[PDB]
Amino acid sequence: GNMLANYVQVYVMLPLDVVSVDNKFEKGDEIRAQLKKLTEAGVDGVMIDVWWGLVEGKGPKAYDWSAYKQVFDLVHEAGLKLQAIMSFHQCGGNVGDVVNIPIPQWVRDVGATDPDIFYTNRGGTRNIEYLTLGVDDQPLFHGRTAVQMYADYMASFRENMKKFLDAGTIVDIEVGLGPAGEMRYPSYPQSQGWVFPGIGEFICYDKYLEADFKAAAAKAGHPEWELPDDAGEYNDTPEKTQFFKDNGTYLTEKGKFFLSWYSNKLIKHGDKILDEANKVFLGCRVQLAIKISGIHWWYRVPNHAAELTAGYYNLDDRDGYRTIARMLTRHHASMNFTCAEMRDSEQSEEAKSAPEELVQQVLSAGWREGLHVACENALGRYDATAYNTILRNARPKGINKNGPPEHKLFGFTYLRLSNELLEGQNYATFQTFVEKMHANLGHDPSVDPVAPLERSKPEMPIEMILKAAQPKLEPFPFDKNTDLPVKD
């Protein structure tokens, strides 16, 4: 047979500051020159955050797409594909961050009288990076619900970016579903004192979510159940808490119920927003995608505390990522993950980290459910070893010289475009990496054509999503090293 299906697309994330904090595009010459280097390297496309805080920052439904239209023109001009992130979250916000784009001010002004629009921890601190899913359907924003704001925003995107959708330049719409665009709770915020590898905190104490839990608990026959109060704080370790210790509460009926409620609220948050995104982009030659955070710390202990507080109900015998993958199937949505470049030996022992096992579990879960799985690197790397790790995860069993690979990533996106990537040995090493991802076949402008987006299949009962959690299956086999390594 033939081995064309070993080809893995490579995308490059554009710089964080590509559009200025005042929603102006001022880097036309630089970007054009940078994209020229990417085409010379055989890159398939680029990816960009489309910041809600810029486009709708001046007022409700006051959409200004003018800066992004200019960037998209340069990408189209370059013959590159484009993945657009609907970025409903804050950019920056930490002391020292250069690019700071909070969510629109008129949205946050509602918090002056209703601070419960923000994800809230047990101590009462409000996180302003992203609106709590508890107000998904609360009409608090000049009459609109949060989901309405997101759907209207994506609708205006489709109408205004018609030229690039019709031409096929845009191939993916990534729907931001939480902090950093990731479908998770803000369980480890730097802005509130979290330091790696703290277990994080459950962030479900805003009045809307607490009322939701109260109702669910009452209906379950346990009105005495309250939200956890024994889980510790951001920087604790699992054994210093009653919730996560051995024979802790997370193993009790009470704990199991809360964790199920917590993680299920997140899954249905994505399910409903993907449903509305599917209707907005119906007929467009795009695939919808979500982004899953790579919470690799405390993976090597039974409590998986850091994953649990982020909203991923993942245990040694419970696959908290295949449930998410099962939810995505009806939307034909792709699952975008991270940590593609990480090796277990690169992490510290005290963090109980296992990024390789995490990546293998997530990829395997997506592949078991027939999804397109794509990945990013979590940290900026320019060394051959990082690329060889990505190559391993891109084709776990290497090249199939007489057919399609057993499994493969649908794509990889490199974080992140910069001048240091495009100079000297960094650029030469990157170009070799693209060649190996393409299986030495060369850049293919027409690979993986995107079919017109079809309507989501019928919504599943939560039982069908939860069925995927157990029995937890072993991951598909991954080779230790790629068969197509890059020379240092």
Residue numbers in the entry: 3 to 490
Sentences from the paper on this structure:
The β‐amylases of crop plants like wheat, soy, or barley have been under investigation for decades and the presence of two general forms has been described.
A refolding attempt yielded soluble, yet misfolded and aggregated protein. However, we were able to optimize the expression conditions to obtain natively folded amylase (named Tri a 17_active). The far‐UV CD spectra of the inactive proteins indicate the presence of β‐sheets and random coil signal, while Tri a 17_active exhibits the high α‐helical content of a TIM‐barrel. The crystal structure of Tri a 17_active shows the same (β/α)8‐barrel architecture found for other plant and bacterial β‐amylases. The enzyme shows a tolerance for low pH, showing maximum activity at pH 5 and retaining over 80% of its maximum activity even at pH 4. A maximum in melting temperature is seen at pH 5.5 with 59°C, with a tail off to lower values as pH increases and a sharp drop in stability at pH 4. Tri a 17_clone and Tri a 17_inactive were recognized by 24% (4 of 17) of wheat food allergic patients with varying intensities, whereas the folded enzyme (Tri a 17_active) was recognized by 41% (7 of 17) of wheat food allergic patients, indicating the presence of conformational IgE epitopes as well as linear epitopes.
